[PDB]
Every structure is written in structure tokens, then in C-alpha cells.
Amino acid sequence: PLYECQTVKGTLSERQRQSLAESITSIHTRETGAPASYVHVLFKELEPGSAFTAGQVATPAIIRGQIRAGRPQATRHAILRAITDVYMAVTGADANAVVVAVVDIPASWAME
Amino acid sequence: PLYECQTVKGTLSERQRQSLAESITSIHTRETGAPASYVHVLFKELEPGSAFTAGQVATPAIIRGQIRAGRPQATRHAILRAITDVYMAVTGADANAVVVAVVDIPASWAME
Amino acid sequence: PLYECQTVKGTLSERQRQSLAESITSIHTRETGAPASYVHVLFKELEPGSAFTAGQVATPAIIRGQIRAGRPQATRHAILRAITDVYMAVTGADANAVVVAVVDIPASWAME
Numbered sequence A, B, C: 001p002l003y004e005c006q007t008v009k010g011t012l013s014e015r016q017r018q019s020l021a022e023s024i025t026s027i028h029t030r031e032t033g034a035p036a037s038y039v040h041v042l043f044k045e046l047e048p049g050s051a052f053t054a055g056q057v058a059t060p061a062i063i064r065g066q067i068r069a070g071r072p073q074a075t076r077h078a079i080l081r082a083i084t085d086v087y088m089a090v091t092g093a094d095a096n097a098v099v100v101a102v103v104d105i106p107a108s109w110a111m112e
Helices: A014-031 A073-091 B014-032 B073-091 C014-032 C073-091
Strands: A002-008 A040-046 A051-053 A061-068 A098-105 B002-008 B040-046 B051-053 B061-068 B098-105 C002-008 C040-046 C051-053 C061-068 C098-105
Touching (some): A002 A014, A014 A040, A014 C051, A040 C040, A051 B014, A061 A073, A073 A098, B002 B014, B014 B040, B014 B061, B014 B073, B040 C040, B051 C014, B061 B073, C002 C014, C014 C040, C014 C073
Parallel strands (some): A002 A040, B002 B040, C002 C040, C061 C098
Antiparallel strands (some): A051 B040, B002 B061, B051 C040
């Protein structure tokens, strides 16, 4: 599985990144039952004038996760809820300034 | 909905990113009938010599958009065309060096 | 066709990026029968400490390829194993620290 977090530069500190990484990992290994050694979390930062919401300069938080297909929605939704809650708990950011998406990738489409 | 623009470092200015963000937002809100508040546009730059076309160093432009599934193909094509026409007009780029993709995301795969 | 390579900043030399760009382009054109002019390879770098495996900081390598739908699995698999072998040869990375994915995008969903 691959989780990518995109925020405007200056949003996350090193401690917050470390926290989110350990948490997101634990969330996946708990909701899916997979070994952590295959769970990858990536953090990317955007320049202040490179993030827009409704056509205006903003600071949205986008977290995207690619997981393996063959899982019920209750599982995906559980991951969505947990990831959403933990980011808001770590950063204190607003809910509508946070977007989380977990998509399916067929196992036949990946090689690890 | 999320739109991401990937170009070589130095391609877009502040004014251009503002224009493209406003343009993409307007195009999406019209064709899909979705509010602007949910429309997010991100800009990412690539280091010189890290973008390749036909095995050689080039400056392609990649704009990818993840929208809600359930809308007809004519709607998607209209979004594809408009974004492509706009980017070429704003930047002056070659059509053969511009790639736009609008993929469907199931409504229950995202949380916001 | 679009191939993105995510690594920790400093992992790939410019010569390594060149070699990977050519071989990946070569593999795709060999297995699909598509012109090289449509093949785009992008190299993105992550800041050290912004890339995590399990719970801690690591140096994973993510190569994601977006190709067009309508092609059989054997084609995609051949691309997957080839890219995997080539990357581990060029860089010397561990197989457990390398992830390759090749996803489908319907021709109606892209424009170039």
C-alpha cells in the first residue's frame, strides 16, 4: 500500500510527519491485516502559490492511499474515517480543508 | 474533485497558476454542476532533466484530474478539451507536449 | 503512456535517470507496439525524512505507470517484471524497497 500526503509548505513539522506516518501505518495494518514493512507513507509539500481552492490561493490537505482490490467498503470507509480523524487530531486543521481518498489497485497491476 | 499540474521548473508563473486554477475550476463547476468549494488545484514542478519524452530530456505538461464517477463521457471529453485548449493558450505549449487525463473516482472512495 | 518515478532526493543520478528513462520507454514500446513519442517518464524526488516505510524513515522507490486500457495482462506483467529488473540493476536497490505499478486508463479519459 502507498499513502501520499500533500500539504502547503510549512503545514507539517517533522514531529507531525513522524506521528502521521506511524499512525497511518498502524491504521492500515489494523484495518487490512497487512505487514507494516510494505506500508509506505510519503510527504510532499507545495509552494504557497501552487495550491488553490475554489480558484483562490488556499491550504487544502490531500491524502491519497493506493490499496489492493478485494476489500469491502466498510474496510475502505474505516480507513477513510481513521485517516481523516488522525490528521485533524495531529494538525488541528479544518475538516473541509482536508480531503482523503483510498483507491483500489488490482493485485495483478502491482509488483513489489 | 482534484486537479494536479506537473510541469518543468520555470514553466508557470504566479499569474499563470492563478489563471489556470480559476479556469479549471470554472470548467469543472460548469460541466459537472458541482460547487467550487470542493474544487482543488495543485501545482508541482519537476527538476530540469527529470522529465523525459521518447527517452530524451523534454518539457511535457501533465494535468491529471480525479472527479466523481457517474457523469457521461460527453461531460468528461468537454472537460478534457477545455483544459487542454486553455493551457496551450496560457503557456504557448505544443499540443504534443501536453497531456490531460480525467479519471472517475467512486463517490465512496473519497472523504471530505 | 506516463511513467512516474518517486525516490528520496539524491537516490538517482542524472545518468541513472537517463538510463531508466530510455529502458522504460524501450520496454513499453516493445510490449505495446506504441510510438516512443507518446511515452513520458517523470522523476520526482522526496525530501529525506518525508518518506516512510513501516513506521520509520526509509528510502522506498515507487514507479507508477499509467497506460491505456484494452491490453491483456501478459503485456502488463512483462512491463512490470522488466521495469523491476532494470531499476534494481541500475540502482542496486532491494526488492523489498521497490514498488512498481502499471494501471489502466481508458482512451476516452486521456487527451494528448
